[model samples]
Target chain A: NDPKVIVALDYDNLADALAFVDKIDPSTCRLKVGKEMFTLFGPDFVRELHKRGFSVFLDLKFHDIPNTCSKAVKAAAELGVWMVNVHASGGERMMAASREILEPYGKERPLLIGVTVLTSMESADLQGIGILSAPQDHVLRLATLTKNAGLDGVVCSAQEASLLKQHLGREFKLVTPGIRPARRIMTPAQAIASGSDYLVIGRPITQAAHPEVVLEEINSSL
Target chain B: DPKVIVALDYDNLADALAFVDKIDPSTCRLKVGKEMFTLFGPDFVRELHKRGFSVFLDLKFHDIPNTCSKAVKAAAELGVWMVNVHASGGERMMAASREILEPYGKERPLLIGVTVLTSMESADLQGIGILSAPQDHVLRLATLTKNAGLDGVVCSAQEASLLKQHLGREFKLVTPGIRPAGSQRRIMTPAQAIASGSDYLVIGRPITQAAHPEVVLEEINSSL
Candidate 1:
């Protein structure tokens, strides 16, 4: 079975990241290549991950005008990543245009996921941005837009996973950060039980004395 | 680098480097936003640094404090001259982003926030449920940006003078949407933008798409 966990390489430099990558097994979990690492290393790093036999989720969270977003999404497809993302708040045009650009790839294209309210944001933070909707409602509203845009799914809070899964249907993939409550933390088992399809576990595993053990422990439970 | 930032808005590194090769880093800071970053990755930013250029990594990060600060830390580690986030990400996100840079001290990249993209008008913002005018909202978001301890924002030239006064002169404004293209509607010329008090004018085609970008850049520099 495919791994449900995605470990983020949240290191400051390549040597540390490469050493950490070397410690983990590809079959045990997928990998997430986000802004910081990508900014430091680039496509070669992503390609290196592929060579190591893991699926890569290019978490660029593209948010720009339609043309730029479309081109970036195409780039992700060409990079041969398993999934990519865009900010749902980038608006319908950005989301739809990005989805359309991937049509040429057909089944080979990376899954397109839209990020709703990030779990780190509190309700007051939502209001600070002029988004009057509560974080859950905001995630739901954006999730609907992700569905409406014909993208594959969304990256949302694990707490909202069951609600989103119930509403968006079984196939709409929900990739969640491990968990958040008053900015809470939860186990991989708890996150999966909460209905999140893919659990994005970073420091919990990465900062551990033995990451592989943590990864295996996670898989053993599920 | 001059106050002008040449946006390497192209997807391909070949074309981006071509533009980079033509211009001196002192002429303008190179802007490698998400489009170029996604397609080309960090090597692209490194390529700019390779040629003695300082980079403005325009990723516009808008995530939780953990992610946002982590991202800012990453940007600082990359040794970028500047970076930005969506001010709409809110005060805490921006504040957290700001606090993370303390370790970098004087060497830290200039941390800015995006007020509103130049392309978005009042009507466009309305669709996103922002009820204010584009002008008003830019100020609103810029205020949040300043309150959160950011250095400045990426705003339209029209709001430059207004923002400078509101946030005080030290708060920077990196102005894009310069006809050098509406999604970019509030666009203007190099001289007009500088006169409007924009600390930095972001131009793409006005320079990159031109017959001789360096000449246009010189033309722009002299104009101010």
Candidate 2:
């Protein structure tokens, strides 16, 4: 099982990212390599992270045609990450194609996740992209679509963790990202207790003065 | 610009390279889209360069501003002829992509935005909650792309003429629905595409699936 926290290595420069990696122990948390770092450094970086004993979550949030999405998953699988993701809005066929491609990997396969609405987006921004509704119901519907397609879980908002876990059941993994320097449930402990399977915290962990201390504190608190 | 861009959407590197071996890069540029790019990664792009083809690295990148910018920077580093992002990523993300390529100077790949897929109809737009007519929405996205300092857009020929009227002639338009009764969705001939102001026509199966792709490529190129 993954540690509850997955630190996002969203660095633009490889050296800076590597130095950040030097500051933490992988056992405290896994790593997330999103578009920027993956593009800049390519798969070698993912391998390097693995060599250093980190299990990576390749967060490409792939959204394209069904065949393309499936092939992309195959490609991601070849990278040997612990997890990968696609956009839930890519619709059923696209996500299913991805799932079907991972059939060979079977038990050893990376966990496939569907990214619901990004927390940066508000309802207005959602509408701008032609997704109508408040972010909550939309996230739920997308999660349902993700579950139906046979994905292992989803990257959902902190607010929807309880609702998604309760509705989708405990077996459906929920990797959440809405934690902030915040009011109530957005705090790390409360977020996990609210049914967030994995909390994706980036800047708070990566940008801290004593990052390991922050990592240690979060793990200890949990 | 090469008039015909053949999409290498094969599942494996060997199949794509075999297809490439059969054709001349002079006739058409190669489009190494997400499927091939994901399967083969950057080395495949370098291999395409090693041969003679200028590639279009069509990842359709959509993410936060900083992330999109860095990915574009990497694409420019790959020496691709062109690359694109989703226009729906908003002005800031597209503008950031344009900015990151500034250091690459004259050698930079043409940065473009994808307005709407050729396969998507008006009803599909509504299905996604985009209530506007497809053309109108495409136009709006194209305008935003031009304003963001991108070189052009990937839109259908149906939208290309209107886009040219509004965004002007220099803004490139890469169209993909080029088929016969065989062309999928909103269709166009390579000739029709060129006439309608499409800067590039992405033709995949019609050419790639042919008995002799070079002949098909030559016919399409000579026809244009």
Candidate 3:
């Protein structure tokens, strides 16, 4: 199975969510459960996905002080996610502490992906919030810091794939969101030709005529 | 009317969740800074908003251009009331972040910058080989941050009045390091901090460390 394209499950309920997941061929893609479903149903949802033999990328995007954030990472680890993350904005202490907390798990540690920038964001949106840089430039800087802080990779826009891959090296995982595929305007092609590792798609697949076919189409493009 | 921002800093979701359950958001605005936010996930933020509370998401931004800008955009999209970056990130970086957030406009949270802290004195600054005192450096950084178009600064209460007077009243002064009158501090008191026109007083350990935290918070609130 190519683990690069982890399908994002931002669904509201278990039955509908399972219906959508039931369609996708497990060998073709991995699974990710973000805030929506995780909040509605706890560890049991994760257990079900594991029962299906799916590698889960839990997109929680945690950010907090050292002790608190690390404990949460441990909890996510307990859920058996293949990957998880805290926000890079949390600084060295938070990230480092999270790393230390994971040491007990050793090789079993879920890949910790630090969220650098949201793919949905642009330079104009940040200016009002007082950040003074171009969006691309800002994403790169945060990516570098996230790497130095000892995280596994980053959640960045596909637009940044080439640059992040070039500067941060090929190994840095770049999971993107604003992916719009060629024919499927509704489902953005998350699979970029560059360094994009995981293409998180939600509405495009959730609202598709046939979600399984739509996801298969999205994966085939890669 | 102004708002009270209270952050429950704990080591895990359980501690934070328990604290939130104890208080209603209607009584005060909540800030899910780096500690609690990362541990809990989007569900945590969603839960807070669901309960009718305003949130100041205090994850300081200090990364390079593309990363920082993308982060700022995401934070805004998440519907946070305020956010921030390190003032030392310099003009170009701050300018880029501000540019990205322009589309959200007024609906976005106030963007603040972290300045040199009073917690670290002159020797501490000099230890890092910075020649200036913490106070002077803080002012210089705050000045630079202001010129870069940041909405406000996270500074000690001691400098709040000076910032308001020098930087103009409109710029937000979100002060931390504010100790209550009876509390120990060589500098300003909470009453004085309020008088200095601080937009927010971030009291963590003082309140969190109290034996009867709820009673202490109420007392502090009554004091204000």
Candidate 4:
């Protein structure tokens, strides 16, 4: 299996964030700068990630009209990051808008993905917002919709990765977060590997004393 | 109006220079939208201005009241002449936007509200399912905008006559879809539309599409 780990570089300041990048083994891991970092430091933060030879996944989760969202994506693309996304709730027109904007970039385009359902929230949370279905089933509907909308892939939780792989097949790139390794006990590597192209973990590695050792432990389990 | 308005949408310096070289700044106003500004740096806007084009920095500001006000102050710091906002942003947003203009109010670009386009009618609204009658909505928004103390609005010429009457002669109506006579195109005529009393007519595709854009703009000017 291809080495698959994208470390979530969730930091408050640019210096602290870059410090993690400077230390982490890039060969086994990629970097993701979410709203916490992007909001505080802006595009310069993403540029710094690029300068460090890391493929930056800028997870802004843009949601707007066709014209407005297209302009926003174009701006992000100009930054030359590896991957980015918008909320799938923005619908086909919005996704199509993002696709059209990146068309001019051609082969150099960033991996444009749409987030189906954030892992932080569950099916009941989704249902409260009127997405009436089981979490996996609802996510499947969104994943298929995202595929049809000309996006490259979907950002789903690790639990739904297998279901996504079964429905969409391995061709669709599935970037999943909420991953934990089985170091002491045989944790679910199959679950992470089964459905995802890229498995993103936060606390399991980041919160560890030796992040590199944790990364190896997770890799061996995989 | 600084004659040349360059679109700083280019990611690379080469693409930007190709445009800057072709268009002379002696007679045109240049536009630096979000894409190029984010990539190249804000200093490029200054360089373009130094090269002699009044820049229309089209960073459509939409956020909370305080953030939008602070952003407008930032724009004032940049020395841009024109800026815009979503008309749907309502009175408080517009009031907050207009408030930012007060400090450097005289030298600021025409702060305008982007009105509803004919392209965004019932289906567009209903698709996202925010059902609104465009003309009625525009009039309602325009009235609130004038009450909020904005200088003008960015609207289609089609609704100019009706909106101008309700909003009054003082509020500037900047029309975007400017088509001249004898062109095979089917958009609104500049002469007929300008007669409705729009302050500034924004011609984009038609002028940009023409073989000799300068001559085409001159022809449109004569007709107006």
Clashes of each: 5, 2, 58, 14
* Candidate number of the best DockQ: 1
Q: Tell me each candidate's TM-score.
A: 0.91, 0.87, 0.61, 0.60
Locate the minimum summed-lDDT window of 10 residues in model 1 chain B. Answer: B178-187
Q: Write the per-residue lDDT of candidate 3 for residues A5-99, one digit (tens) a residue.
A: 67777665679889877777778678887644553555578878989888888765665446666877887777768998776655656677888
The 10 consecutive residues of candidate 4 chain A with the worst lDDT sum are: A123-132
TM-score of candidate 1 on Cα atoms, chains taken together: 0.91
Q: Chain A only: TM-score of every candidate?
A: 0.94, 0.95, 0.89, 0.91
lDDT of each: 0.83, 0.82, 0.70, 0.67
lDDT of 1 by residue, A44-158 (tens): 9999999989899988788877887798899899899999999887877789999999999989999999988776678787778777777777778789888988899999766
For model 1 chain A, give the 10-residue run with minimal summed lDDT: A178-187
Q: Which residues of candidate 3, in runs, are more than 4 Å off?
A: A9-28, A31-56, A60-75, A78-80, A86-94, A117-140, A182-193, A220-222, B1-6, B11-159, B162-176, B181-188, B218-223
List model 4 lDDT by residue over A102-201, tens digit each: 9999988889988775554465444333344676766777788778878889887666777888888788898877666754222447656577778777
Off by over 4 Å in 4: A1-46, A53-72, A82-94, A100-222, B1-26, B38-41, B117-119, B209-211
**Candidate 2: Cα lDDT at B121:** 70
I-RMSD for candidate 2: 2.7
Every model: iRMSD: 1.8, 2.7, 8.6, 7.9
DockQ agreement of candidate 1 with the native complex: 0.55
- Candidate 2, residue B31: Cα displacement in angstroms equals 1.6
Query: What is the C-alpha lDDT profile of model 4 across B1-224, one tens digit per residue?
Result: 43223345555767566556556565567666655554554567777877766777665554335445555566666677776665544466678878878878578766777655444666554433234576766776677668778877767777888888888888988766666666545567877667777766766555555567667656666675
Order the candidate numbers by lDDT, best to worst.
1, 2, 3, 4
* lDDT at B56, model 3: 79
RMSD value for candidate 1: 3.1
Whole-model alpha-carbon lDDT for candidate 2? 0.82
- DockQ of predicted candidate 4: 0.10
